[model samples]
Target: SMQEEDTFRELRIFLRNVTHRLAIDKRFRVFTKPVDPDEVPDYRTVIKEPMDLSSVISKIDLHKYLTVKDYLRDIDLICSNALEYNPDRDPGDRLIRHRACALRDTAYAIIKEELDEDFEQLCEEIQESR
Candidate 1:
């Protein structure tokens, strides 16, 4: 239980940092749900408190738990999408696309650092078995 909480804490910090970085770009506007039109924009207020593990677990579509492997897969998917982004000949779109790719790459590097060598070996073994 404590381990799960720690994992969520890390994830929350990761998410907050990513979003805060994105918000720093003047071209982009950040919006959180239950938006108040009258309220002024503030990164601290928008990001709010760190998400708890129980809240995250409860919101999963069909799973009771999440693992580091699952997070890796999700981030990998995001990275792949960033790679495939078309940019479509628009400067603004291109900027956002490039920014997203950069952020995802950074996130990948950050998370990968936390993983152990055995986990990498396990991944290799799985690939070989497949």
Candidate 2:
């Protein structure tokens, strides 16, 4: 029980590191909130599962996530939905499409730069601690 807590405690910082860097950029606006169903009714139909940064932060605060893998899963979902919705067409939320790609690319880059190795170390640590 408490053992899992350590993993999640450090996991929060893992996500926060990427979140902090993402906050300092221009493309940050797109994924900060959930996609609006009223404005983009088709978005719901197109994307069955949705994820956003504000929800990401809220979930972390609420301890809704218990591991970094799940945290990353949601982040990845946000981008996946965005990426899947666009077809490289003429218009239609193209700017938002671009921003979603940017956030996905940058966030993962930050994750690797900041946490790739530490994650291996974490697994090793958590195992022996058990």
Candidate 3:
């Protein structure tokens, strides 16, 4: 049905807008790509699931997400892996930890500031259609 196609486009455009919005921030540069062990040792052992902004972009373009929540999950996963790997207790790597916190909070603000209402409406519509 044309209705289904239209609703599906909503999901894609919504995801795209958020993805583009998130990508605009300079701070996201480091988190844009996957973490490599060579760059930061012991990264593999600490982070079993490696998630990043670029990966999220790939998924969105591939049409892998069923709803908005799935896209946000990837965004959250990026910060989650970083936060877990770099703890506040470790003063030596506090910069890493702090940066993750800023990205986490900053991403939240970005999502809420512009994406909140539209995101919620788009999210509910996608789920309802399913």
> What lDDT score goes with residue 116 in model 1?
62
Ranking by TM-score: 3, 2, 1
What are the Cα lDDT values of the candidates? 0.46, 0.74, 0.74
* Candidate 1: segments with Cα more than 4 A from true spot: 1-65, 77-86, 119-130
Q: Tell me the spans in candidate 3 whose CA falls farther than 4 Å from its real position.
A: 88-92, 116-122, 125-129
What does the lDDT come to for candidate 1? 0.46
In the range 11-77, model 3's lDDT, one tens digit per residue, is 7787777677667777677787888778788888878889887888788778788666666777778
Clashes of 1: 0
The numbered model that scores best in lDDT is 2
**Which residue pairs in candidate 3 have backbone atoms (N, alpha carbon, C) closer than 3 angstroms, thus clashing?**
none
Over 1-130, each residue of candidate 2 has an lDDT whose tens digit, in order, gives: 6866777688777676667667667667777789888988898888988888878888877876555566778878987888788767767568767887788778777667767676656655665675
1-130: candidate 1 lDDT, tens digit per residue: 5644554555445544544544454433321122233663552353443232223333343442234455445445443443343347678557757765665566567556755656445444543453
RMSD of 2: 3.3
TM-score for each of the candidates: 0.40, 0.75, 0.77
